[PDB]
JSON list of C-alpha atoms in Angstrom, two decimals:
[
{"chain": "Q", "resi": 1, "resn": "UNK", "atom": "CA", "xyz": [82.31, -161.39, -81.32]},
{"chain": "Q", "resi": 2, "resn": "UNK", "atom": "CA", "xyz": [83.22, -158.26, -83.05]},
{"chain": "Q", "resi": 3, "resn": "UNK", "atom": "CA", "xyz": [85.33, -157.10, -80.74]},
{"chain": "Q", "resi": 4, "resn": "UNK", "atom": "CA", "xyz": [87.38, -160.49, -80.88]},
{"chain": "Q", "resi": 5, "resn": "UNK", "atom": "CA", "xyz": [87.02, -159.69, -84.47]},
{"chain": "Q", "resi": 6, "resn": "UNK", "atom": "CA", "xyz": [89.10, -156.28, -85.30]},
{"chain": "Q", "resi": 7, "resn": "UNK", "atom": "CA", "xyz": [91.50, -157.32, -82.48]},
{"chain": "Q", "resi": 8, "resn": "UNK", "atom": "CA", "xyz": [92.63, -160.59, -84.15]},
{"chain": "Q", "resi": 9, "resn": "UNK", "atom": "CA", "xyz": [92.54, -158.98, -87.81]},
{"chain": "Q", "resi": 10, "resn": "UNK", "atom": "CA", "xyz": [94.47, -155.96, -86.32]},
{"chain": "Q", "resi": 11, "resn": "UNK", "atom": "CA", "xyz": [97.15, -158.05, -85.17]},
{"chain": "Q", "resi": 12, "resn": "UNK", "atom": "CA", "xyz": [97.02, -160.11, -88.08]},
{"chain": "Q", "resi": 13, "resn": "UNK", "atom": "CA", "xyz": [97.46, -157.69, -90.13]},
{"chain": "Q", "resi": 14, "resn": "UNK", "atom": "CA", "xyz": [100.43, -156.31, -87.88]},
{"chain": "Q", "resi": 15, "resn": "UNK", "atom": "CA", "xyz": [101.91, -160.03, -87.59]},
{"chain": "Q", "resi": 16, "resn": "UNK", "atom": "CA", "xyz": [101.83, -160.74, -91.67]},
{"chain": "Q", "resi": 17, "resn": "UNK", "atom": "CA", "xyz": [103.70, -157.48, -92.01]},
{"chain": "Q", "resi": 18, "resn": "UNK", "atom": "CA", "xyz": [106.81, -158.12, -89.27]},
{"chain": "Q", "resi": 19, "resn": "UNK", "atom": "CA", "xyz": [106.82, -161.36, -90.71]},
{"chain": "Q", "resi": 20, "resn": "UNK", "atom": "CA", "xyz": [107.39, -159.59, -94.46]},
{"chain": "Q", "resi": 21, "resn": "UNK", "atom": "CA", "xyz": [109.76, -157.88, -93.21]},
{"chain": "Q", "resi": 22, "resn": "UNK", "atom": "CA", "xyz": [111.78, -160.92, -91.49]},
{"chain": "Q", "resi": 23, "resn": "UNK", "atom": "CA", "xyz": [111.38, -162.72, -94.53]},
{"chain": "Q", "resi": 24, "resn": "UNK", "atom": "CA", "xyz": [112.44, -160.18, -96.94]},
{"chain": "Q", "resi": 25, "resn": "UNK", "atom": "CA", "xyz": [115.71, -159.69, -94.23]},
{"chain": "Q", "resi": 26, "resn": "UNK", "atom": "CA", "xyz": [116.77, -162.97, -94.00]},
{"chain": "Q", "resi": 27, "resn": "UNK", "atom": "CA", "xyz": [116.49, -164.20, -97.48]},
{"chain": "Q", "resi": 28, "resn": "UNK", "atom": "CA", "xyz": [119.57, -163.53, -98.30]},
{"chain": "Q", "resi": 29, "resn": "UNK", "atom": "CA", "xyz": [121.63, -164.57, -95.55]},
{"chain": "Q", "resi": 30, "resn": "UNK", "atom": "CA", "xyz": [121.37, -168.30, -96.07]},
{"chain": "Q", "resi": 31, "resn": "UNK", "atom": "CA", "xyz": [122.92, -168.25, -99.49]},
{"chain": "Q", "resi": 32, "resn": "UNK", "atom": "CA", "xyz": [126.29, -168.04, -97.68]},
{"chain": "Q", "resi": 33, "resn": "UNK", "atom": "CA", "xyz": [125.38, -172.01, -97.21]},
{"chain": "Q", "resi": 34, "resn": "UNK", "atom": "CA", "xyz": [123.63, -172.55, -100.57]},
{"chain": "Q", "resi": 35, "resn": "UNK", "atom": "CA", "xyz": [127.42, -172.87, -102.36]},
{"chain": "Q", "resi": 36, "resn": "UNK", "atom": "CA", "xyz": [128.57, -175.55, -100.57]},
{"chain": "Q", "resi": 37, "resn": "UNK", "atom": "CA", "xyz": [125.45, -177.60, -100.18]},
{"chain": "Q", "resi": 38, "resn": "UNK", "atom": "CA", "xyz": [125.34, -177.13, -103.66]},
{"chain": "Q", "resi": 39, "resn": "UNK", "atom": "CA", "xyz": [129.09, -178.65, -103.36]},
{"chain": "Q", "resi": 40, "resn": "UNK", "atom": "CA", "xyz": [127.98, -182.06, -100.96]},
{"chain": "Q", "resi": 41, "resn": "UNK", "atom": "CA", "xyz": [125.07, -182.50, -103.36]},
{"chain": "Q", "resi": 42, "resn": "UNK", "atom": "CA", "xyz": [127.53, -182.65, -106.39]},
{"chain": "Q", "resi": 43, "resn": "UNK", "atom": "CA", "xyz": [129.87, -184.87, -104.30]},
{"chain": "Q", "resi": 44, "resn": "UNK", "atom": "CA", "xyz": [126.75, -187.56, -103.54]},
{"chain": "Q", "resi": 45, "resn": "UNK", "atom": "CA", "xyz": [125.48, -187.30, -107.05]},
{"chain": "Q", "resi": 46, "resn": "UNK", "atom": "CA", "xyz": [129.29, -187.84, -108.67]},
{"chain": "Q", "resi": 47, "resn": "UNK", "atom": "CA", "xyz": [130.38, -190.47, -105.58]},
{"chain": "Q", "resi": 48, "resn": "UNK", "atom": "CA", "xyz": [133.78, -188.22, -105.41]},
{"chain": "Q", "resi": 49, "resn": "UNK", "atom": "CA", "xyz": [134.83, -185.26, -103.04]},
{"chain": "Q", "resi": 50, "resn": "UNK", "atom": "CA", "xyz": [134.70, -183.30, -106.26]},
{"chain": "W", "resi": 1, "resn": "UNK", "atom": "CA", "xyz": [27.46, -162.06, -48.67]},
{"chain": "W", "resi": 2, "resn": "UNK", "atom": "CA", "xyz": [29.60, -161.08, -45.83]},
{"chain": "W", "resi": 3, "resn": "UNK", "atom": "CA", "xyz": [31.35, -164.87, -46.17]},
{"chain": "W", "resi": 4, "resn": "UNK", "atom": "CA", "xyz": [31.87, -163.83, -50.30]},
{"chain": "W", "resi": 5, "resn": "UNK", "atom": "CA", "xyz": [33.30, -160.30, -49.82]},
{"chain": "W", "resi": 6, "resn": "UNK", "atom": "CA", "xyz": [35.90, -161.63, -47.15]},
{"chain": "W", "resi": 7, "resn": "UNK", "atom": "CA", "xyz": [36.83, -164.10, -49.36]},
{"chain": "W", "resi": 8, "resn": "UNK", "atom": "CA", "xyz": [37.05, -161.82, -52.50]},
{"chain": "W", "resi": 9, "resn": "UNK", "atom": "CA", "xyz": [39.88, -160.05, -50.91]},
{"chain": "W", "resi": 10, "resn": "UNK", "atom": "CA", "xyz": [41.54, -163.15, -49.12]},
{"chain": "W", "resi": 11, "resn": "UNK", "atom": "CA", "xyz": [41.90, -164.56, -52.97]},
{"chain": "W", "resi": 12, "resn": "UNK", "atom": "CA", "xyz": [42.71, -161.19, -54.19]},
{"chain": "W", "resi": 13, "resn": "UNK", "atom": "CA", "xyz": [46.24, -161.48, -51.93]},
{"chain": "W", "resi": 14, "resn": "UNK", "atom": "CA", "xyz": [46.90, -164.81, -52.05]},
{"chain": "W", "resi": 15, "resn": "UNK", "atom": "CA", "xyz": [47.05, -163.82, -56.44]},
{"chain": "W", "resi": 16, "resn": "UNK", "atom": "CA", "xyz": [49.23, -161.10, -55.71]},
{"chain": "W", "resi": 17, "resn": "UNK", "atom": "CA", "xyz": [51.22, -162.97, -53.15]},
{"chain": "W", "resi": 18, "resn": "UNK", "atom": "CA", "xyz": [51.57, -165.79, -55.59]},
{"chain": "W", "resi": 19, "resn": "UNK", "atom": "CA", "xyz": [52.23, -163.78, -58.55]},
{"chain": "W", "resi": 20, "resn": "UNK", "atom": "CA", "xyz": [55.04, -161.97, -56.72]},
{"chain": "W", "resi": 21, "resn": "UNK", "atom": "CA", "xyz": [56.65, -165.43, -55.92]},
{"chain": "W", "resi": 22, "resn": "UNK", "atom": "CA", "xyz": [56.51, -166.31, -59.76]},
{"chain": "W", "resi": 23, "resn": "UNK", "atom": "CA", "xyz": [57.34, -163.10, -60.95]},
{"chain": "W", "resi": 24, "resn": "UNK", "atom": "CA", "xyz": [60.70, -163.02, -58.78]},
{"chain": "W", "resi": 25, "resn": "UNK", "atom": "CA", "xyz": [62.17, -166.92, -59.88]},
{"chain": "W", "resi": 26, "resn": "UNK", "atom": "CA", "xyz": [61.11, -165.74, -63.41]},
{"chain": "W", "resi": 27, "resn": "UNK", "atom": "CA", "xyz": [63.39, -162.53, -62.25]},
{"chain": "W", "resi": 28, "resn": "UNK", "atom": "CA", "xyz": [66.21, -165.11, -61.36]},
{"chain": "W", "resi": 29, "resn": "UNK", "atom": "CA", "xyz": [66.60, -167.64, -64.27]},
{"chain": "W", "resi": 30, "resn": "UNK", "atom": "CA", "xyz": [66.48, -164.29, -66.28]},
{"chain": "W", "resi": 31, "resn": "UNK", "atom": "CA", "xyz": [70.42, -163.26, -64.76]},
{"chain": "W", "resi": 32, "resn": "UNK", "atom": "CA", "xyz": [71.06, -166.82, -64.17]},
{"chain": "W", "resi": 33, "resn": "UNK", "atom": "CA", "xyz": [70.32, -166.96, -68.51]},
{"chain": "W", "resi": 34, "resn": "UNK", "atom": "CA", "xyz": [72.43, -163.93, -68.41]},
{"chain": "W", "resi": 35, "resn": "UNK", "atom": "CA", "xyz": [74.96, -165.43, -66.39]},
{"chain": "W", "resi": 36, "resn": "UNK", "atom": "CA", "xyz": [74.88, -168.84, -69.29]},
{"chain": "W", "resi": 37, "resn": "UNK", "atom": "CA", "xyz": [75.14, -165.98, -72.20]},
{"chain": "W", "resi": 38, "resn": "UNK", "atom": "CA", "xyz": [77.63, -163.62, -71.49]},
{"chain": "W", "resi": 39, "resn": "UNK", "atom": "CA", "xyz": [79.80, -167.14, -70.83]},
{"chain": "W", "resi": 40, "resn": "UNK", "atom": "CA", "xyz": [78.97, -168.39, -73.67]},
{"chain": "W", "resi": 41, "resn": "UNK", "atom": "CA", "xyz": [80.02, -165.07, -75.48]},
{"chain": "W", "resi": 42, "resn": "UNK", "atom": "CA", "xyz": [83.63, -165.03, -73.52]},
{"chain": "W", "resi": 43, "resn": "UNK", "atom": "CA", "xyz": [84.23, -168.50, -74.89]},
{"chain": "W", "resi": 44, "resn": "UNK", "atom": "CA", "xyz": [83.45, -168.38, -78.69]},
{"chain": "W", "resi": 45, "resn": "UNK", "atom": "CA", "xyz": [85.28, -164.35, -78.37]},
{"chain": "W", "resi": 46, "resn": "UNK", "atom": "CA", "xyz": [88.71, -166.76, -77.11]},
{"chain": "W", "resi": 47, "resn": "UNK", "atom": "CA", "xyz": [88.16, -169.45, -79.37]},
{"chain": "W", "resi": 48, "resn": "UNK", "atom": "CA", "xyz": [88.09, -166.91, -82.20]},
{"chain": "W", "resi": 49, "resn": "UNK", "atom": "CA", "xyz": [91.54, -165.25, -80.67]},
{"chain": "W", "resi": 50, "resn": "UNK", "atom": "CA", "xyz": [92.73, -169.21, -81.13]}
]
């Protein structure tokens, strides 16, 4: 049991951290999208291209 | 007391005979309960890793 114990929290621990670190890299690179979905969103909510 | 002597050593190996019998199945269900535990302890150690 124990031994299934520090493996799994090792790896957690290991796991939450790459993850951090994919998170904290990728954040950012979506917002190239967040402008013009901001723009379709303004287009449904006016009923115009504009 | 002949008859009684003979017979106090034919029941004295027929004990040990018998004894040896129970004493080896209690030997066998004891790894075959060994054989059950350590099974048991591989399959609660994976469904931890799950």
């Amino acid at each position: 049991r124990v031994r299934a114990e520090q493996q799994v929290a090792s790896t957690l621990q290991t796991a939450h951290e790459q993850l951090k670190r994919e998170r904290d890299a990728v954040e950012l690179d979506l917002r190239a999208h967040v402008g013009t979905m901001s723009a379709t969103l303004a287009s449904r909510i006016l009923g115009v291209d504009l | 007391l002949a008859e009684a002597s003979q017979a106090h050593t034919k029941a004295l190996e027929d004990a040990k005979s018998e004894a040896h019998r129970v004493v080896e199945e209690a030997r066998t269900d004891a790894e075959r309960i060994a054989e059950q535990l350590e099974a048991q302890a591989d399959v609660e150690a994976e469904r931890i890793k799950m």
